Amino acid sequence: GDILRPLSDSEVDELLDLYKVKFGIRNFHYLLLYNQRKWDRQLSEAQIPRNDLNHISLRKQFYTHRRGNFRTWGTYVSLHRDIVQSVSFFSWQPDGAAELWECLEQTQLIEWTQGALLTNVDLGFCNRVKELAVSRGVTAIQPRQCFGMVLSHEDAFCAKVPDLPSEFEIRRLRAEDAAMVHDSWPNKGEGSLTYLQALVRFNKSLGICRSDTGELIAWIFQNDFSGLGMLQVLPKAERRGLGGLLAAAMSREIARGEEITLTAWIVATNWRSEALLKRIGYQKDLVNEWIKLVPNS
């Protein structure tokens, strides 16, 4: 069949420890692998059939070169489904990573022409992968640089957290909250409402509501790397220190509920989020690209 061969659950687990050993607990591919398997376990105990349409956003299918050993170079390609197809991949083969590109170029499981989203792409794979996209029909690409911010577990565990102003209350988000958080998205085409609903269910989240009206005014989620994501404060509540409060609280909550490095993916131009994350202790130790391929025509 395809040059990409689906790894069994047992193999993904091995893939996970390979990255753990090779790069350490702060590595983003390890975090991605760690996160997925965490969800796999939960969704399993929650007796939710795989491929379940309203939870598929919480699933991933890992693959490797059908005629290669995923252990020698950690070569892998994952496929995710929500609105479009999201692809992640890596390999540490010392020279051009032939095995990897053999996979990406010879496979037909990737929707190069159907708006596929390339997530967390290493800077060394960006140019070549864009050329490939074009060689397969892509006529327009929308790439963006993201900073991978990192905070050790120890730091997150012992982190301090600001005081919440009387005007507000904090609570975990609930299903009804999903639609509001989704409505404040300007370029909402990568994450679906149902994805958000799955996240409020299986991931940690935090919302800030006015003690009066009870109106949700700011929120933060745990992301697909078990770190922080989708932070946002409605304009009418800006400059009240809530943004930094959410980030601090979520960092602490995650670190005390599980053992992992806290991280966050932010757009390189989001100077304000970089700044508040930095104040909490997060450091910038990675730069990756998110490459959104525009559907043919």
Long-range contacts at 142-145 (CB < 8 A, ≥ 24 apart): 142/291, 142/292, 142/293, 142/294, 143/289, 143/290, 143/291, 143/292, 144/267, 144/268, 144/289, 144/290, 144/292, 145/267, 145/268, 145/287, 145/288, 145/289
Residues in the chain: 297
Residue pair 30/86 in contact (Cβ under 8 Å)? The answer is no
The strand order across the sheet containing 216-222 reads: 4-6, 61-65, 76-81, 85-90, 117-122, 283-293, 141-151, 262-267, 228-233, 216-222, 205-210, 168-171
DSSP codes of every residue in the chain: --SEEEPPHHHHHHHHHHHHHHH-TT-HHHHHHHHHHHHHHHHHHTT--TT-TTTGGG--EEEEETTS-HHHH--EEEEEESSSEEEEEE---TTTTHHHHHHHHH-SSS-TTTT-EEEEEEHHHHHHHHHHHHHTT---EEEEEEEEEEE-HHHHHT---PPPPTTEEEE---GGGHHHHHHT-TT-SSS-HHHHHHHHHHS-EEEEEETTT--EEEEEEE-TTSSEEEEEE-GGG-SSSHHHHHHHHHHHHHHHHS-S-EEEEEETT-HHHHHHHHHHT-EEEEEEEEEEEPP--
The string over 198-209, giving b where at least 16 C-beta atoms fall within 10 Å of a residue's C-beta and e elsewhere, is: bbbbbbbbbbbb
Query: Could you give all domains of the chain from N- to C-terminal order, each with its CATH number?
Result: 1-152+284-297 (3.40.630.30), 153-283 (3.40.630.30)
The string over 269-285, giving b where at least 16 C-beta atoms fall within 10 Å of a residue's C-beta and e elsewhere, is: eeeebbebbeebbbeee
Distance CA(268)–CA(273), nearest Å, equals: 10
Token pair 């007796």 is found at: 47
Distance CA(259)–CA(297), nearest Å, equals: 45
Tell me the backbone φ, ψ of residue 214, rounded to 5 degrees.
Answer: 80, 5
Give first-to-last CA distance, the chain, whole Å. Answer: 29
DSSP codes of every residue in 126-180: HHHHHHHHHHTT---EEEEEEEEEEE-HHHHHT---PPPPTTEEEE---GGGHHH
Distance CA(256)–CA(252), nearest Å, equals: 6
Q: Which two tokens stand for residue 79?
A: 């496929």
Q: Which residues pair with 170 in a beta bridge?
A: 208
Distance CA(195)–CA(188), nearest Å, equals: 12
Distance CA(29)–CA(35), nearest Å, equals: 10
